[PDB]
Amino acid sequence: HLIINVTRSDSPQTITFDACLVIPCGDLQSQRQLAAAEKYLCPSEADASTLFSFPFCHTWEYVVWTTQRQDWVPSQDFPLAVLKPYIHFTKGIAPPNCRYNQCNPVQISITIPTLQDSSPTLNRFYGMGADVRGKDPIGFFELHLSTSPSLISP
Ligand SMILES: *[C@@H]1O[C@H](CO)[C@@H](O[C@@H]2O[C@H](CO)[C@@H](O[C@@H]3O[C@H](CO)[C@@H](O)[C@H](O)[C@@H]3O)[C@H](O)[C@H]2NC(C)=O)[C@H](O)[C@H]1NC(C)=O
């Protein structure tokens, strides 16, 4: 699966990549249809050995971020909704002659410093979907924060 490698920083940090690295969009003609569609992002509680038993963006309650301008109000009782202020999820625009895996630019902006971990960690799996008019295609990916052990680290 796709692993997004994030270098821990003391400042905010934006990340641009193509949604169809994550979402099963299909061939190029299908990706071009998806270019103008909205995307959404769901944090998951699955690990590497349980990926197949926690389906991603399975209900509306798992959606914490969307590429819409109006900001998505997460589910009050979803435990991972607290991650909401740490991430902004936006949609880019692609040229009309866009090429494979380059018609759906999205941006993940980590709004907090990352040298230390957040109380619910950002280092986890995430689901991504495309707001389409048939069954939304849904994929997942791993957000991996780099680590560098300190000198006094035991
Ligand atoms: C995030 O970092 C990991 C490594 O910690 C990347 O995983 C590895 O990515 C490389 C690059 O695509 C994959 O192939 C590589 O090919 C080069 C040929 O120059 C070779 O020198 C490397 O040793 C490696 O074989 C590799 O399959 C993949 N997995 C492993 C275990 O290395 C990952 O790609 C990075 N994420 C992104 C978005 O780049």
Residue numbers in the entry: 53 to 206
Give sentences from the paper.
EnvP(b)1 is an endogenous retroviral envelope gene found in human and other primate genomes. EnvP(b)1 has the characteristics of a classical gammaretroviral envelope protein. When ectopically expressed, human EnvP(b)1 can mediate fusion of cells in culture. EnvP(b)1 has all the hallmarks of a viral fusogen that has been repurposed to perform a host function.
We determined the crystal structure of the human EnvP(b)1 iRBD. Single anomalous dispersion (SAD) from a platinum derivative was used to obtain experimental phases and ultimately produce a model. The iRBD’s core is defined by a β sandwich that shares some similarity with a V-type Ig fold, although it lacks the first β sheet at the N terminus. Extensions between the β sheets form a series of loops and α-helical regions that decorate the core. There is weak sequence identity between these features and the gammaretrovirus variable regions A, B, and C (VRA, VRB, and VRC, respectively), which are believed to dictate Env-receptor interactions for gammaretroviruses. The iRBD shares little (∼20%) sequence identity with these examples, yet it shows extremely strong structural similarities. The EnvP(b)1 iRBD is more compact with shorter, less prominent loop structures extending from its core. All three VRs are shorter in EnvP(b)1: VRA and VRB are dramatically shorter, and the VRC, also shorter, adopts a different conformation as it is liberated from constraints by the absence of the paired Cys residues that form a disulfide in FrMLV and FeLV. As a consequence, the potential receptor-interacting interfaces of EnvP(b)1 are quite different from those for FrMLV and FeLV. The β sandwich core, a central helix that runs perpendicular to it, and an 8-amino-acid loop between the last two β sheets are all structurally conserved.
